[PDB]
Design a protein around this nucleic acid. Structure first.
Ligand SMILES: [Cl-]
Ligand SMILES: [Cl-]
Ligand SMILES: [K+]
Ligand SMILES: [Mg+2]
Ligand SMILES: [Mg+2]
Ligand SMILES: [Mg+2]
Ligand SMILES: [Mg+2]
Ligand SMILES: [Mg+2]
Ligand SMILES: [Mg+2]
Ligand SMILES: [Mg+2]
Ligand SMILES: [Mg+2]
Ligand SMILES: [Mg+2]
Ligand code: NA
Ligand code: NA
Ligand code: NA
Ligand code: NA
Ligand code: NA
Ligand code: NA
Ligand code: NA
Ligand code: NA
Ligand code: NA
Ligand code: NA
Ligand code: NA
Ligand code: NA
Ligand code: NA
Lengths: 46, 65, 194, 81, 56
RNA sequence: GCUUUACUGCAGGCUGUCGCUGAG
RNA sequence: AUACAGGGUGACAACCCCGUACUCGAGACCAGUACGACGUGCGGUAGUGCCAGAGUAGCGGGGGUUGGAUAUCCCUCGCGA
RNA sequence: GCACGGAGGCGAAGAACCAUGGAUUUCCGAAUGAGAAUCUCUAACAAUUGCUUCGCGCAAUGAGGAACCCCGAGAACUGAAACAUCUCAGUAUCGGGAGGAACAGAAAACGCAAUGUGAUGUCGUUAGUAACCGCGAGUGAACGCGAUACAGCCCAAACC
């Protein structure tokens, strides 16, 4: 299925949010990404 | 920091624009050293350049250009 | 002696007799081809108009409004409804045709607010009423002592809140005495029992 | 006011095109047309622009492939920054 | 042919997409009207008094 | 839910009359 | 101690710290209101049938509503001072 | 910033922080040049109005807001130990709209009938009284008094 310039951006953001919390924030907070979206298991919008 | 307020005002309409285009270029050669995995950074400065450009534009509008 | 106005006012006491009747039979013909909301340049009933608030000023507008004659164009109940609520033909609205006219008009002229209204005839399948509107954003009226108040924010979209003269008459707020128990100060604060 | 050139795209592939083809890859604002990309490049690095190829990245940004005329040298331009 | 498992296979038509106005995936691209905010049908945000209890 | 010469209704059709509606 | 309300502080704190009473200041609301001032001119007699809001007052039919009974309020049809 | 890492930077040119006023303030959005699932195509108050130098020139409306408010549209389960009037109830829900509050309001009033009271809300009471009702279930005021807060005005016409 073809996409629009817009959708293509949304998908991209949706993929960036899908990265893990930096190992450094770990140490700064002295101690989990609750929005980890797998491609197969989960479904985005649209 | 390396660029204060009074000083921005003492300049002429043409100097702000000249300095703005000077910093814009340094900020641009900054993002290139970073996008290149570069290490000779000085983190405080790349931040400053942004705030400086704000100060300059902020004054440009304040003086009537 | 009698003013010129008093003639027009008298003529209209029996619109079926004399010259006015000969007039109605004419205009009405031209009135039936005209749209619902038509802006006319001058009041048909100059007297009544003036006596309602009319003035030959900038920002004072008049207009005729034609509405279908009849009873509740109520659709029949589709689900289960007991014998009493099974009406469609007979039951009529609780809002008189004149008031319906005022609204169709105020809408047509968004920015304007409604001063008053009055009847100007009716045939076998429609009734006409003229409407006096005012432009509360025009300095003429903002400066005119006699109309100034209509600019007040709390006067905006007044015809829709029933704040007209024809409105209060419909709401049963004429007599300050007997009968007005269930209408003053408002229908909603009386549980809608009038 | 939005800036056309965001920054130089430096990757193994970008180098290839640069070495053997004299091409400079960039990161540019997504509203910037090929033509616009052209100008801002000639103006920022003082060169002659031949052709520009654009592409909207799966990184929310647009990617400009710009080729410098047979007179200018890519490798030399990208090194002074 | 069951309406179940077997008829789930044809379901590959797109309908409700990301509404430009409210930001929900309720913009029916075949009707071009949002099921949530009502964008495309009303200039006024769709809102009903039954989205909550009566005395609330 | 359905039915009918179950009770009470309602659209709807037919009909008189009122207005629209005037001239000999 | 006009301050023994409450909190903090390595355990139960008036006197360790924040504050608390006393006094003081600033905004907002009251309100462009009260008062004041400026202009305008209140009132009274005799005479004069010159003026005072119409599909209105009101009547009848059909619906509705009300505690409103004949004696609630509204709508519609027709007649109408 | 939360958020206590690492690198670095800022602050006596008085930073941070706070208060007030100002600047900037992408795209969709009443969304308004036109089209569109947040982007696109070649100058814009789109649409409806008002004033009008009749030129979008000057203006107005649109949409949001916890609930309150105002005018319209208006259920049924249920109660009546069934059930049709009645009840639930002018409730729920729907349509349109205003403000910081709304609405009402200076008597063609009241009618403790009087030599009397004197705009309108609201609170207390009158009172579950009068009145209504397969007179069944049930529904149910007012004048008045006691309080709160008080405030009074303008056209139309005669005559110019
Ligand atoms: Cl109005
Ligand atoms: Cl009394
Ligand atoms: K029932
Ligand atoms: Mg391409
Ligand atoms: Mg009843
Ligand atoms: Mg648009
Ligand atoms: Mg039942
Ligand atoms: Mg029962
Ligand atoms: Mg009230
Ligand atoms: Mg019984
Ligand atoms: Mg009742
Ligand atoms: Mg009474
Ligand atoms: Na999936
Ligand atoms: Na209006
Ligand atoms: Na009633
Ligand atoms: Na990047
Ligand atoms: Na059944
Ligand atoms: Na009648
Ligand atoms: Na802002
Ligand atoms: Na406008
Ligand atoms: Na114009
Ligand atoms: Na029962
Ligand atoms: Na039963
Ligand atoms: Na007494
Ligand atoms: Na009964």
């Amino acid at each position: 299925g073809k996409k629009s310039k817009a959708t293509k951006k949304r998908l991209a953001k949706l993929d960036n949010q899908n990265s893990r919390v930096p190992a450094w924030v770990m140490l700064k907070t002295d101690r989990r990404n609750h929005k980890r979206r797998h491609w197969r298991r989960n479904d985005t919008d649209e | 920091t390396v660029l204060h307020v009074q000083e921005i005002r003492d300049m002429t309409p043409a100097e702000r624009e000249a300095e703005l285009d000077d910093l814009k270029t340094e900020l641009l050669n900054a993002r290139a050293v970073q996008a290149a995995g570069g290490a000779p950074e000085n983190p405080g400065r790349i931040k400053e350049l942004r705030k400086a450009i704000a100060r300059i534009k902020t004054i440009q509008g304040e003086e009537g250009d | 002696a009698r003013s010129a106005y008093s003639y027009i006012r008298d003529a209209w006491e029996n619109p079926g007799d004399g010259q006015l009747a000969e007039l109605q039979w004419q205009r009405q013909q031209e009135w039936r081809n005209e749209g619902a909301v038509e802006r006319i340049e001058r009041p048909t009933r100059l007297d009544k108009a003036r006596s309602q608030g009319y003035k030959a000023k900038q920002g004072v507008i008049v207009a005729r409004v034609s509405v279908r004659k009849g009873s509740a164009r109520k659709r029949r109940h589709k689900a289960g409804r007991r014998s009493k609520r099974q009406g469609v033909t007979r039951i009529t609205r609780r809002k008189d045709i004149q008031r319906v006219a005022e609204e169709r008009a105020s809408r047509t002229f968004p920015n304007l607010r409604v001063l008053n209204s009055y009847s100007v005839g009716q045939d076998g399948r429609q009734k006409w009423h003229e409407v006096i509107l005012i432009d509360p954003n025009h300095p003429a009226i903002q400066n005119d002592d006699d109309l100034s108040w209509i600019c007040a924010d709390d006067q905006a979209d007044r015809v829709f809140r029933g704040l007209t003269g024809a409105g209060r008459r419909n709401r049963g707020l004429s007599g300050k005495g007997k009968g007005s128990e269930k209408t003053r100060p408002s229908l909603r604060s009386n549980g809608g029992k009038a | 006011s939005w800036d056309v050139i965001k920054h130089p795209h430096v990757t193994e592939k970008a180098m290839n095109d640069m070495d053997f083809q004299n091409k400079l890859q960039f990161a540019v604002d997504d509203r910037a047309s090929k033509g616009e990309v052209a100008d801002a490049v000639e103006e920022q690095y003082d060169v002659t622009v031949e052709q520009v190829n654009t592409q909207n990245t799966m990184d929310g940004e647009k990617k400009a492939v710009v080729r410098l005329s047979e007179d200018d040298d890519a490798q030399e331009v990208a090194s002074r920054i | 042919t069951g309406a179940g498992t077997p008829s789930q296979g044809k379901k590959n038509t797109t309908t409700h997409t990301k509404c430009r106005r409210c930001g929900e995936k309720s913009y029916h691209t075949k009707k071009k009207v949002c099921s949530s905010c009502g964008f495309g049908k009303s200039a006024k945000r769709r809102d009903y008094e039954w989205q909550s209890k009566a005395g609330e």
